[PDB]
């Protein structure tokens, strides 16, 4: 009938991956933490990757940098931490002692 | 069927906190047209019209205190999918668990 008996939290799992795509860094091509905007267009990167390419801006959209100083995004930052939670909710830690 | 209340309260807590990041800093209305303001802040576009329409000169960032002007902000579309996607996440929750989200 099922691999792990029902399983549940299936639809939620797919939702996590979806939101992750909106947080997945462009350079690290993965989940970031406390990244930086810069991508005035529609791109985003961590706060330790774009710094090595601020002279230009975005490596894809080729858009010029808008922030001279390595600013931070509390919004996107909090989004990452939240996404991490759901990841554990789906995994479910089964352990007593 | 509330999914047997098994790890259902935890998820709902993550869905709510998520909406906070994709919320509004002026009218508290789920932003639709995310626009980056001079102060690196997001808005619903229309919110800027009123903030700038007011006879008080350059807009005043209500998030910090001020620092906003007409020829500054621009629809970058960065917090768009984050808002639309999130909405789809809450739908799945009620679809299975069927628990309350917010009122
Ligand atoms: Zn990166
Ligand atoms: Zn770009
Ligand atoms: Zn608004
Ligand atoms: Zn501000």
Swiss-Prot record, chain A:
It is found in: Nucleus. Transmembrane segments: none annotated. It comes from the Eukaryota. A zinc finger (RING-type) spans 25-62. Residues 1-94 are annotated as: Interaction with BRCA1. Processed during apoptosis. The homodimer is more susceptible to proteolytic cleavage than the BARD1/BRCA1 heterodimer. E3 ubiquitin-protein ligase. The BRCA1-BARD1 heterodimer specifically mediates the formation of 'Lys-6'-linked polyubiquitin chains and coordinates a diverse range of cellular pathways such as DNA damage repair, ubiquitination and transcriptional regulation to maintain genomic stability. Plays a central role in the control of the cell cycle in response to DNA damage. Acts by mediating ubiquitin E3 ligase activity that is required for its tumor suppressor function. Also forms a heterodimer with CSTF1/CSTF-50 to modulate mRNA processing and RNAP II stability by inhibiting pre-mRNA 3' cleavage. Homo- and heterodimer. Heterodimer (RING-type zinc finger) with BRCA1. Heterodimer (via ANK repeats and BRCT domains) with CSTF1/CSTF-50. Component of the BRCA1-A complex, at least composed of the BRCA1, BARD1, UIMC1/RAP80, ABRAXAS1, BRCC3/BRCC36, BABAM2 and BABAM1/NBA1. Interacts with UBXN1. This is BRCA1-associated RING domain protein 1. It comes from Homo sapiens (Human). The gene is BARD1. The chain holds residues 26 to 122 of 777 of the full protein.
From Swiss-Prot, chain B:
Changing residue 71 to K: In BC; uncertain significance. The modification N-acetylmethionine is found at residue 1. Isoform 1 and isoform 3 are widely expressed. Isoform 3 is reduced or absent in several breast and ovarian cancer cell lines. Phosphorylated in response to IR, UV, and various stimuli that cause checkpoint activation, probably by ATM or ATR. Phosphorylation by AURKA regulates centrosomal microtubule nucleation. Autoubiquitinated, undergoes 'Lys-6'-linked polyubiquitination. 'Lys-6'-linked polyubiquitination does not promote degradation. It is found in: Nucleus; Chromosome; Cytoplasm. E3 ubiquitin-protein ligase that specifically mediates the formation of 'Lys-6'-linked polyubiquitin chains and plays a central role in DNA repair by facilitating cellular responses to DNA damage. It is unclear whether it also mediates the formation of other types of polyubiquitin chains. The BRCA1-BARD1 heterodimer coordinates a diverse range of cellular pathways such as DNA damage repair, ubiquitination and transcriptional regulation to maintain genomic stability. Regulates centrosomal microtubule nucleation. This is Breast cancer type 1 susceptibility protein.
